[PDB]
Design an enzyme around this catalytic site. Structure first.
Site, PDB file in Angstrom:
ATOM      1  N   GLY A  10       0.804  -1.210   0.000  1.00  0.00           N
ATOM      2  CA  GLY A  10       0.000   0.000   0.000  1.00  0.00           C
ATOM      3  C   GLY A  10       0.843   1.268   0.000  1.00  0.00           C
ATOM      4  O   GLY A  10       2.025   1.233   0.348  1.00  0.00           O
ATOM      5  N   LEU A  11       0.238   2.387  -0.398  1.00  0.00           N
ATOM      6  CA  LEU A  11       0.925   3.674  -0.447  1.00  0.00           C
ATOM      7  C   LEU A  11       0.647   4.492   0.814  1.00  0.00           C
ATOM      8  O   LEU A  11      -0.507   4.756   1.144  1.00  0.00           O
ATOM      9  CB  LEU A  11       0.473   4.475  -1.670  1.00  0.00           C
ATOM     10  CG  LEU A  11       1.146   5.837  -1.833  1.00  0.00           C
ATOM     11  CD1 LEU A  11       2.538   5.640  -2.400  1.00  0.00           C
ATOM     12  CD2 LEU A  11       0.331   6.746  -2.738  1.00  0.00           C
ATOM     13  N   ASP A  20      -3.038   4.171   2.380  1.00  0.00           N
ATOM     14  CA  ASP A  20      -3.152   4.369   3.823  1.00  0.00           C
ATOM     15  C   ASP A  20      -3.315   5.868   4.101  1.00  0.00           C
ATOM     16  O   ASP A  20      -2.467   6.667   3.709  1.00  0.00           O
ATOM     17  CB  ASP A  20      -1.913   3.832   4.541  1.00  0.00           C
ATOM     18  CG  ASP A  20      -2.022   3.947   6.052  1.00  0.00           C
ATOM     19  OD1 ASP A  20      -1.354   4.819   6.648  1.00  0.00           O
ATOM     20  OD2 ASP A  20      -2.799   3.171   6.645  1.00  0.00           O
ATOM     21  N   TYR A  51      -3.199  13.661   8.993  1.00  0.00           N
ATOM     22  CA  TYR A  51      -2.195  13.940   7.960  1.00  0.00           C
ATOM     23  C   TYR A  51      -2.525  15.235   7.214  1.00  0.00           C
ATOM     24  O   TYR A  51      -1.704  15.751   6.461  1.00  0.00           O
ATOM     25  CB  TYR A  51      -2.083  12.772   6.967  1.00  0.00           C
ATOM     26  CG  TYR A  51      -1.648  11.452   7.581  1.00  0.00           C
ATOM     27  CD1 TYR A  51      -1.176  11.390   8.898  1.00  0.00           C
ATOM     28  CD2 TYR A  51      -1.709  10.266   6.846  1.00  0.00           C
ATOM     29  CE1 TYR A  51      -0.778  10.175   9.461  1.00  0.00           C
ATOM     30  CE2 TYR A  51      -1.314   9.049   7.401  1.00  0.00           C
ATOM     31  CZ  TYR A  51      -0.851   9.011   8.706  1.00  0.00           C
ATOM     32  OH  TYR A  51      -0.460   7.815   9.261  1.00  0.00           O
ATOM     33  N   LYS A  76      -7.817   6.443   9.759  1.00  0.00           N
ATOM     34  CA  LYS A  76      -7.704   6.226  11.192  1.00  0.00           C
ATOM     35  C   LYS A  76      -8.393   7.292  12.025  1.00  0.00           C
ATOM     36  O   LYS A  76      -8.393   8.467  11.662  1.00  0.00           O
ATOM     37  CB  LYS A  76      -6.215   6.179  11.579  1.00  0.00           C
ATOM     38  CG  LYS A  76      -5.328   5.492  10.544  1.00  0.00           C
ATOM     39  CD  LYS A  76      -3.890   5.411  10.973  1.00  0.00           C
ATOM     40  CE  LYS A  76      -3.029   4.822   9.869  1.00  0.00           C
ATOM     41  NZ  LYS A  76      -2.778   5.765   8.759  1.00  0.00           N
ATOM     42  N   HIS A 130      -6.199   5.104  15.621  1.00  0.00           N
ATOM     43  CA  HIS A 130      -4.818   5.563  15.423  1.00  0.00           C
ATOM     44  C   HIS A 130      -3.830   5.254  16.558  1.00  0.00           C
ATOM     45  O   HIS A 130      -2.736   4.736  16.309  1.00  0.00           O
ATOM     46  CB  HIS A 130      -4.824   7.061  15.099  1.00  0.00           C
ATOM     47  CG  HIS A 130      -3.737   7.485  14.160  1.00  0.00           C
ATOM     48  ND1 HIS A 130      -3.901   8.505  13.248  1.00  0.00           N
ATOM     49  CD2 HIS A 130      -2.473   7.031  13.995  1.00  0.00           C
ATOM     50  CE1 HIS A 130      -2.784   8.663  12.562  1.00  0.00           C
ATOM     51  NE2 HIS A 130      -1.901   7.781  12.995  1.00  0.00           N
TER      52      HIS A 130
HETATM   53  N1  LIG Z   1      -0.331   4.202  12.294  1.00  0.00           N
HETATM   54  C1  LIG Z   1       0.635   5.032  12.672  1.00  0.00           C
HETATM   55  O1  LIG Z   1       0.780   5.430  13.830  1.00  0.00           O
HETATM   56  C2  LIG Z   1       1.631   5.427  11.578  1.00  0.00           C
HETATM   57  C3  LIG Z   1       2.822   6.062  11.910  1.00  0.00           C
HETATM   58  C4  LIG Z   1       3.786   6.331  10.941  1.00  0.00           C
HETATM   59  C5  LIG Z   1       3.538   5.979   9.620  1.00  0.00           C
HETATM   60  N2  LIG Z   1       2.331   5.351   9.271  1.00  0.00           N
HETATM   61  C6  LIG Z   1       2.031   5.066   7.862  1.00  0.00           C
HETATM   62  O2  LIG Z   1       3.161   4.417   7.285  1.00  0.00           O
HETATM   63  C7  LIG Z   1       3.460   5.092   6.057  1.00  0.00           C
HETATM   64  C8  LIG Z   1       4.932   4.863   5.740  1.00  0.00           C
HETATM   65  O3  LIG Z   1       5.772   5.274   6.836  1.00  0.00           O
HETATM   66  P1  LIG Z   1       6.561   6.686   6.846  1.00  0.00           P
HETATM   67  O4  LIG Z   1       5.878   7.743   6.092  1.00  0.00           O
HETATM   68  O5  LIG Z   1       6.896   6.920   8.253  1.00  0.00           O
HETATM   69  O6  LIG Z   1       7.951   6.407   6.072  1.00  0.00           O
HETATM   70  P2  LIG Z   1       8.684   5.331   5.130  1.00  0.00           P
HETATM   71  O7  LIG Z   1       7.811   4.775   4.087  1.00  0.00           O
HETATM   72  O8  LIG Z   1       9.442   4.422   5.994  1.00  0.00           O
HETATM   73  O9  LIG Z   1       9.706   6.348   4.458  1.00  0.00           O
HETATM   74  C9  LIG Z   1       9.225   7.433   3.669  1.00  0.00           C
HETATM   75  C10 LIG Z   1      10.456   8.189   3.202  1.00  0.00           C
HETATM   76  O10 LIG Z   1      11.291   7.316   2.411  1.00  0.00           O
HETATM   77  C11 LIG Z   1      11.468   7.878   1.105  1.00  0.00           C
HETATM   78  N3  LIG Z   1      11.445   6.809   0.079  1.00  0.00           N
HETATM   79  C12 LIG Z   1      10.383   6.125  -0.388  1.00  0.00           C
HETATM   80  N4  LIG Z   1      10.776   5.244  -1.315  1.00  0.00           N
HETATM   81  C13 LIG Z   1      12.088   5.418  -1.406  1.00  0.00           C
HETATM   82  C14 LIG Z   1      12.957   4.750  -2.273  1.00  0.00           C
HETATM   83  N5  LIG Z   1      12.564   3.798  -3.116  1.00  0.00           N
HETATM   84  N6  LIG Z   1      14.257   5.121  -2.214  1.00  0.00           N
HETATM   85  C15 LIG Z   1      14.686   6.062  -1.365  1.00  0.00           C
HETATM   86  N7  LIG Z   1      13.850   6.685  -0.535  1.00  0.00           N
HETATM   87  C16 LIG Z   1      12.535   6.387  -0.546  1.00  0.00           C
HETATM   88  C17 LIG Z   1      10.364   8.885   0.907  1.00  0.00           C
HETATM   89  O11 LIG Z   1      10.788   9.974   0.083  1.00  0.00           O
HETATM   90  P3  LIG Z   1       9.851  10.684  -0.997  1.00  0.00           P
HETATM   91  O12 LIG Z   1       8.478  10.693  -0.456  1.00  0.00           O
HETATM   92  O13 LIG Z   1      10.506  11.998  -1.018  1.00  0.00           O
HETATM   93  O14 LIG Z   1      10.046   9.867  -2.206  1.00  0.00           O
HETATM   94  C18 LIG Z   1      10.157   9.382   2.316  1.00  0.00           C
HETATM   95  O15 LIG Z   1      11.075  10.431   2.592  1.00  0.00           O
HETATM   96  C19 LIG Z   1       3.131   6.532   6.383  1.00  0.00           C
HETATM   97  O16 LIG Z   1       3.092   7.443   5.293  1.00  0.00           O
HETATM   98  C20 LIG Z   1       1.798   6.331   7.047  1.00  0.00           C
HETATM   99  O17 LIG Z   1       0.811   6.163   6.031  1.00  0.00           O
HETATM  100  C21 LIG Z   1       1.390   5.065  10.256  1.00  0.00           C
HETATM  101  C1  LIG Z   2       0.560  14.373  14.518  1.00  0.00           C
HETATM  102  C2  LIG Z   2       1.391  13.667  13.461  1.00  0.00           C
HETATM  103  C3  LIG Z   2       1.009  12.180  13.455  1.00  0.00           C
HETATM  104  C4  LIG Z   2       1.834  11.442  12.400  1.00  0.00           C
HETATM  105  C5  LIG Z   2       2.414  10.159  12.995  1.00  0.00           C
HETATM  106  C6  LIG Z   2       1.313   9.103  13.090  1.00  0.00           C
HETATM  107  O1  LIG Z   2       1.001   8.544  12.049  1.00  0.00           O
HETATM  108  O2  LIG Z   2       0.843   8.925  14.200  1.00  0.00           O
END
Ligand SMILES: NC(=O)c1ccc[n+]([C@@H]2O[C@H](COP(=O)([O-])OP(=O)(O)OC[C@H]3O[C@@H](n4cnc5c(N)ncnc54)[C@H](OP(=O)(O)O)[C@@H]3O)[C@@H](O)[C@H]2O)c1
Ligand SMILES: CCCCCC(=O)O
Length: 314
Positions: free
Chosen positions: A15-16, A42, A47, A76, A109
């Protein structure tokens, strides 16, 4: 390609993610993702970009690229909406921004409830987060009726430790079991115990921050980098893949749903080419040994909250 949830639905393993995706970049990001083949997005109210994600989803649906049943949209419930009477309203706001009539999955969340208001992190005169006296069981009962009303197909949790998940599973009169527990997972925080527990109970695990979240606003120059780990670079080079492709394939082989975030077209495309290769059991065991118990999301402002999830071992 897809994992079976306890409600009979099929959840796309890839997923994205959209946290940190700017409003002016995410619409195009989601459009490219859907074109590339992503069928799982996601989202989250906190956000501040669901309207823009919804613009992308609406365009692809009108274009006939995908039909609604093919997409798996996740959102969430934020901490400031844990009270009984506020859950439906929060869900409906997300639905209008995304411009959908139902969500495939709706997650609580964080297990921590904050005082209702306009501020996502309400503070008192001292500067600390103000808690809500609501509990996990009462919030869950409110999520259950969203299923009974047709707003969402499945409900789940996020950042819940094993005892918190236990509380829901042992709740008197429980109608719907949590379908998914979305937690932080990567080579530096393997979560072997929480993952084994959830999977034994039939709860699907979704790994967030699979790349280590290099764009988190709280990043420090001395913090470890997964993408730049020479040991992970070596495994990637041995497979003719990028380190990101290895980090995304890693959770998939552990039967976890993975949601890497990206707003860059070439990276969104690169992150998709993870179905044509396999990591050996040796590569897998080696990646698991890199565990340091390092968390990207520790919700440090709520360390004193009665429902803080990270004091327990798992
Ligand atoms: N439920 C929760 O509490 C919670 C908390 C944190 C995250 N999440 C979800 O998890 C998702 C993913 O986690 P995350 O946003 O923390 O980070 P992540 O996916 O671990 O990392 C995102 C970062 O990595 C870079 N990236 C992506 N693909 C890459 C590649 N192929 N090569 C090099 N760099 C790359 C992106 O850059 P660019 O975007 O600049 O390409 C961005 O800066 C979130 O967006 C969110 O939807 C949920
Ligand atoms: C307030 C910012 C929340 C982003 C980190 C999370 O996904 O919980």
């Amino acid at each position: 390609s897809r994992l079976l949830l306890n409600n009979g639905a099929k959840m796309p393993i890839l997923g994205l993610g959209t946290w940190k995706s700017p409003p002016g970049q995410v619409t195009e990001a989601v459009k490219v993702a859907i074109d590339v083949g992503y069928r799982h997005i996601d989202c989250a109210h906190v956000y501040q970009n669901e309207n823009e994600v919804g613009v992308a989803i609406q365009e692809k649906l009108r274009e006939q690229v995908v039909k609604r049943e093919e997409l798996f949209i996740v959102s969430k419930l934020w901490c400031t909406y844990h009270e009984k009477g506020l859950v439906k309203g929060a869900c409906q706001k997300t639905l209008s921004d995304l411009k959908l009539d139902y969500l495939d999955l709706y997650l609580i969340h964080w297990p921590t409830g904050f005082k209702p208001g306009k501020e996502f992190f309400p503070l008192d005169e001292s500067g600390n987060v103000v808690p809500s006296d609501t509990n996990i069981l009462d919030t869950w009962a409110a999520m259950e009726e969203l299923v009974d009303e047709g707003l969402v197909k499945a409900i789940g949790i996020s950042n819940f430790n094993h005892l918190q998940v236990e509380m829901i599973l042992n709740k008197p009169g429980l109608k719907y079991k949590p379908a998914v527990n979305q937690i932080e997972c990567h080579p530096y925080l393997t979560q072997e115990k929480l993952i084994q527990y959830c999977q034994s109970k039939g709860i699907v695990v979704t790994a967030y921050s699979p790349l280590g979240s290099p764009d988190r606003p709280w990043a420090k120059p001395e913090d470890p980098s997964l993408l730049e780990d020479p040991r992970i670079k070596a495994i990637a080079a041995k497979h003719n893949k990028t380190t990101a492709q290895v980090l995304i394939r890693f959770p998939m082989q552990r039967n976890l749903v993975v949601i890497p975030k990206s707003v860059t077209p070439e990276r969104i495309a690169e992150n998709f080419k993870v179905f044509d290769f396999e990591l050996s059991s040796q590569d897998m065991t080696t990646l698991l040994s890199y565990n340091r118990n390092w968390r990207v999301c520790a919700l440090l402002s709520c360390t004193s909250h009665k429902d803080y999830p990270f004091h327990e071992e798992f």
